[PDB]
Write a protein that binds this ligand. Structure first.
Ligand SMILES: *[C@@H]1O[C@H](CO[C@@H]2O[C@@H](C)[C@@H](O)[C@@H](O)[C@@H]2O)[C@@H](O)[C@H](O)[C@H]1NC(C)=O
Ligand SMILES: *[C@@H]1[C@H](O)[C@@H](O)[C@H](O)[C@@H](C(=O)O)[C@H]1NCCCCCCCCN=[N+]=[N-]
Ligand SMILES: *[C@@H]1O[C@H](CO)[C@@H](O)[C@H](O)[C@H]1NC(C)=O
Ligand SMILES: *[C@@H]1O[C@H](CO)[C@@H](O)[C@H](O)[C@H]1NC(C)=O
Lengths: 74, 384
């Protein structure tokens, strides 16, 4: 037999998640790719990104702790 | 891993991408910049904060990634107490900046092994007052050794439950009521499992992680990665969406912020996994009071789900996801109710089309599949 009965608790919310509950990362190592500007400039990628709004975008990764900001760089 | 520099240009590309996509950027700062006596040297951060202020960028911050493994990665050990003090110093810098109300999250520790739990607890004692959410990371498997069977194994899925409980034990003991975020998470570490992390089979883990996170009190889950080198990407190198992207989109369109509970009657809760939320109110088709059930079937046969009173006769919409062949669960293409999901063009996501079921019918869930079901006119007051 492959029929299964479900029980539902519906009296009150048990938790409240953020509207941004499903969020995403971009690994900090992607900033070392020579093509970073082309990649994040892609209209196609931006369209896919917009689809997941609202969401946090975490820029971070193992490389976070090996990245130094240089105001002089081109 | 070696030090590397990044430019004002790189910052602008990142911010622009986030801002034009309706995403809220969180930027991780380098925590391995230490002084003589191993305090955090904040001066490089200052330069970045100054630049972002001048450009008027609205950004949230983190400091460090997986500090539990700094000894392995950089041969430097930073304990949790010190790390907490470092966050206190960043918090002072943010408060003196033009966005003095910017959010700060941390410490982005790995899953709670004994040594990591200790670091997290000492960090929350020291620095827990100035963080807006506690971030930690979780992975099920090693991408090098993960198998297909591992991706389908309820015992592997179940391991996440204990990690969540352990994190909440640490948090309740130090900063009770502080929000808890998964700050980096995926199927498998080391960049993902080749030919598994980018397939339909990846969805069993991702959808279950979402369900459990929401059910257990995790407020935000951050998927490693949206786009990137790792196989666990939502979007591949051609800017094409993989099955987890489509699952993530569907999840977002259907699932509301109020979390409820579902469970299956009987001693076998392992292979049929069920979650229940209020329906996302911003969805134009549905109304206040509707419910969104989602279910994963890890059995090798179809199961038929019966809804309890008083929902047993309601109109239900099905949103069943199944792979496009010939590669089965290892497919990188997915069908929604038998229609392949594909972009309409570079600017246009397709509509996500429901399949209305006969009122009073049991909900069919084929073997090795996942589906959402919206119960229309459920009239649940907790959702309204
Ligand atoms: C199918 O799975 C079996 C174990 O699962 C149980 O039996 C099947 C037929 C379903 O009723 C399921 O709900 C049960 O939990 C295995 O013993 C069997 O080898 C599997 N068949 C295959 C791989 O062909
Ligand atoms: C998170 C990290 O920030 C990313 O930059 C990595 O690309 C990502 C990944 O590995 O794909 C992820 N790193 C997680 C590292 C977890 C390793 C766990 C090792 C467990 C060994 N001991 N035991 N048991
Ligand atoms: C902090 O870093 C800068 C640049 O690396 C260095 O010149 C400065 O002396 C450091 N400060 C301390 C207190 O070590
Ligand atoms: C943690 O490290 C700091 C800085 O090196 C040190 O002074 C302190 O004694 C350590 N704390 C504990 C609890 O061991």
């Amino acid at each position: 037999q492959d029929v299964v009965d479900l029980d539902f608790f519906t009296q009150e919310p048990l938790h409240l998640v953020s509207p941004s509950f499903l969020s995403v990362t971009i690994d900090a190592n992607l900033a070392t790719d020579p093509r970073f500007l082309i990649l994040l400039g892609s209209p196609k990628l931006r369209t896919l990104a917009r689809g997941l709004s609202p969401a946090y975008l975490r820029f971070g990764g193992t490389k976070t702790d090996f990245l130094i900001f240089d105001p002089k760089k081109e | 891993f070696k030090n590397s520099t990044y430019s004002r240009s790189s910052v602008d590309v990142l911010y622009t991408f986030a801002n034009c996509s309706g995403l809220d950027l969180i930027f991780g700062l380098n925590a391995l910049l230490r002084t003589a006596d191993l305090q955090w040297n904040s001066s490089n951060a200052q330069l970045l904060l100054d630049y972002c202020s001048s450009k008027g960028y609205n950004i949230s911050w983190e400091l460090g990634n997986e500090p539990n493994s700094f000894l392995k990665k950089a041969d430097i050990f930073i304990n949790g107490s010190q790390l907490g003090e470092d966050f206190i110093q960043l918090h002072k810098l943010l408060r003196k900046s033009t966005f003095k109300n910017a959010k700060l999250y941390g410490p982005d520790v790995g899953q709670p092994r004994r040594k990591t739990a200790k670091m997290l607890k000492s960090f929350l004692k020291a620095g827990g007052e100035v963080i807006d959410s506690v971030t930690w990371h979780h992975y099920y498997l090693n991408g090098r050794t993960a198998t297909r069977e591992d991706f389908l194994n309820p015992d592997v899925l179940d391991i996440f439950i204990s990690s969540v409980q352990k994190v909440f034990q640490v948090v309740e003991s130090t900063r009770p009521g502080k929000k808890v975020w998964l700050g980096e998470t995926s199927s498998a570490y080391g960049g993902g499992a080749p030919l598994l992390s980018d397939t339909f089979a990846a969805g069993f883990m991702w959808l279950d992680k979402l369900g459990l996170s929401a059910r257990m009190g995790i407020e935000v889950v951050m998927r490693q990665v949206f786009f990137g080198a790792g196989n666990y990407h939502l979007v591949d190198e051609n800017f094409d969406p993989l099955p987890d992207y489509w699952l993530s989109l569907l999840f977002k369109k259907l699932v509301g912020t109020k979390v409820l509970m579902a469970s299956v009657q009987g001693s076998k809760r392992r292979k049929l996994r069920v979650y229940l939320h209020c329906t996302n109110t911003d969805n134009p088709r549905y109304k206040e009071g509707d419910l969104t059930l989602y279910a994963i079937n890890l059995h090798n046969v179809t199961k038929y789900l019966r809804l309890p009173y008083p929902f047993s006769n309601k109109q239900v919409d099905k949103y069943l996801l199944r792979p496009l062949g010939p590669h089965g669960l290892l497919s990188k293409s997915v069908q929604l109710n038998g229609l392949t999901l594909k972009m309409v063009d570079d600017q246009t996501l397709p509509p996500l089309m429901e399949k209305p079921l006969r009122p009073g019918s049991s909900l069919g869930l084929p073997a090795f599949s996942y589906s959402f079901f919206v119960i229309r006119n459920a009239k649940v007051a907790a959702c309204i």
